Design a protein around this ligand. Sequence first.
Ligand SMILES: Nc1nc2c(c(=O)[nH]1)N[C@H]1C(S)=C(S)[C@@H](COP(=O)(O)OP(=O)(O)OC[C@H]3O[C@@H](n4cnc5c(=O)[nH]c(N)nc54)[C@H](O)[C@@H]3O)O[C@H]1N2
Ligand SMILES: Nc1nc2c(c(=O)[nH]1)N[C@H]1[C@@H](S)[C@H](S)[C@@H](COP(=O)(O)OP(=O)(O)OC[C@H]3O[C@@H](n4cnc5c(=O)[nH]c(N)nc54)[C@H](O)[C@@H]3O)O[C@H]1N2
Ligand code: SF4
Ligand SMILES: [Mo]
Length: 697
Amino acid sequence: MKKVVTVCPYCASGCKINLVVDNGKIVRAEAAQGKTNQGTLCLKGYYGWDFINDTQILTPRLKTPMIRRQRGGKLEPVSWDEALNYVAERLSAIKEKYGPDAIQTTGSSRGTGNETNYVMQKFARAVIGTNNVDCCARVXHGPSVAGLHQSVGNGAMSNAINEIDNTDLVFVFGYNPADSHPIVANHVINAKRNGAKIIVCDPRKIETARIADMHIALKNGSNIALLNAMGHVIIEENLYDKAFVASRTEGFEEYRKIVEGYTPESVEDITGVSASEIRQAARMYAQAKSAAILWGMGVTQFYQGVETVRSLTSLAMLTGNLGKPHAGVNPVRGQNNVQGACDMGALPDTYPGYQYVKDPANREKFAKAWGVESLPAHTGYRISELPHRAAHGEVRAAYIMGEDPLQTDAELSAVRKAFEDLELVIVQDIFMTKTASAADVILPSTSWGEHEGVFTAADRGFQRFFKAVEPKWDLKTDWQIISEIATRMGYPMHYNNTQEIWDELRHLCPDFYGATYEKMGELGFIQWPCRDTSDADQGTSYLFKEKFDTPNGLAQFFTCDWVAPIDKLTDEYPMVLSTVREVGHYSCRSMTGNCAALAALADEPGYAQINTEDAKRLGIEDEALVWVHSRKGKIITRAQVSDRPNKGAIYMTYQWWPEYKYCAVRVEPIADQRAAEQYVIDEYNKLKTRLREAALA
Ligand SMILES: Nc1nc2c(c(=O)[nH]1)N[C@H]1C(S)=C(S)[C@@H](COP(=O)(O)OP(=O)(O)OC[C@H]3O[C@@H](n4cnc5c(=O)[nH]c(N)nc54)[C@H](O)[C@@H]3O)O[C@H]1N2
Ligand SMILES: Nc1nc2c(c(=O)[nH]1)N[C@H]1[C@@H](S)[C@H](S)[C@@H](COP(=O)(O)OP(=O)(O)OC[C@H]3O[C@@H](n4cnc5c(=O)[nH]c(N)nc54)[C@H](O)[C@@H]3O)O[C@H]1N2
Ligand code: SF4
Ligand SMILES: [Mo]
């Protein structure tokens, strides 16, 4: 009986967990003293280790390689030799026929770890010869989509999670940590215990709003209108930091011109917030000695979302809430390793350590390190473009590792046809997912629990996680799989352990070089940049102390005009639909839904939060199934009738089996509940049986 230290594989809070191991099996999980969690876990860390054991509650663990030889055929189990040879031969053949850019790779933001992601992008670049490497969820980063990067030159959380506790004001905008990042919510609560003020800008009455000094309950989609009026108040009442603006920013005058028209009064009907409330919130934010903005992954989907991110960041620039502790702009992103995948250069325009492929010095270094003559300079395809590339023949093969697009991507029949248009789809996962079940080849990897590595938490904190248990089947780690494919394609690659991979990237990434395995250890939390291996360098708590990471080191102001959501409301569709996380289950659900304790918590088809008054009016009872009508769409869901959602909007916990957050819908009650209930059981049994048969064939 021993404790093996790991990091939670769910959200990006980065909680350290001691997995109790007795006789080669995990026996229970308990909170370890991680930097972020300090002996606490939410439900998911505590009960969510159970999927490792292949419970088969929702879907089985992948146990063997598989190949679907004919297109409308069965996945058949095969040896590793057969699978890895097949893939190396197909990829090689595709590369020679169509060029390297005909192949798309993905990183993975989940249990695999940082080392895997570095290896995947190495494979794409040194072996295949393409920059086509990307992750679904990604930090604000590229030229093709606006974000934080244009404002401050880094898409990361500017300040640590542990810095939240001593901020004077937490400005939570489009963010629900109580359900999304329970341990981050504990830091917000502790900030309030420590006397911080709290402003929540959220249409709904979320948990954090209960403890908020102001809950700005703004109409769904009204974000830029509110943000501009807040900037208007800050500028017109002279509450901005003039020194900071003069010396550390540009673009003020152009921003001032736009927000000048946006009086709190001009925006009362649009935001549903009184001008007085707008003034008070803008005052509270501007007057706090140090204020941290927290927002969610989240804001970028409300669209005007990427403008909203910059408009928010502009508020922090306006008030000098950047380049000092307990302040900042802090997109707390979702997945346990969304940050790390990006750190490892699982993005189409950059090597690990945000060393852009367009720089010839960077190409030279990596090329030399990687024993290759030339590395490609042009930006690869984004995984979100896959349906378009596949349809038009630009991408012929997808190597999809640790992503489930046929579950978790907008319009599921788009990526389905994408898989049809593609010549070859490889899925490397730990479960028979919807996506894996539609693949040509399945490569089963080890899971979190069965291997080790490094994750990067929400605030760029590198942490080690250790192997607790041996895989029960003949599994390879993700990086073992890639390395073997790489070698079979003519490029010698092998590693004996993740430290070898980590040490290689350290020597290629000046901002990660100091973050040795020894420095991270069992409980260390090392935020990058960490440049010196000396134990004197323990990382960077917050960014931008001296300058910003923009070309000329000045932060860049931005906002724009408010534009009403594209899906307008009608008498035919009088409700807003938006999506929302729930604490007890995680998104893919292949992990939480395969945990006996967590699975007992959440019913199918899932829940839709409806306002009490809306429900009264519509004849919708609590717990009663309901239909939700959009356009080219209708869905069945369960009513969670509460006063938490705002009247006029329903919030679906959409984890169940580009404006994701605003959508015009109608909600109709079901007369025959018993038939609708049976129907739900019927469809869930269908899917469960389908994935079962896919796996045990
Ligand atoms: N328990 C659990 N936690 C998770 C996950 C999970 O599946 N389960 N998934 C993780 C992942 S991958 C992600 S991306 C995160 C997502 O977590 P979040 O970043 O928190 O995204 P949401 O919860 O979907 O939306 C957050 C808030 O946006 C509000 N909102 C909706 N419309 C508007 C608007 O127009 N303006 C404003 N200001 N607010 C609005 C909603 O009411 C909600 O409270 O959760 C992460 N954590
Ligand atoms: N319409 C719409 N579109 C959206 C989103 C939305 O809300 N709505 N969300 C966006 C972001 S926020 C989310 S996090 C992202 C989710 O997709 P993804 O990461 O691929 O699914 P995932 O479910 O987390 O699947 C992760 C897979 O990884 C497997 N896995 C987990 N651990 C490992 C491992 O160690 N090795 C390997 N090879 N695989 C592993 C999981 O089983 C799962 O299939 O896509 C964006 N698009
Ligand atoms: S899901 Fe998030 S808050 Fe909960 S134990 Fe895991 S890392 Fe911590
Ligand atoms: Mo996410």
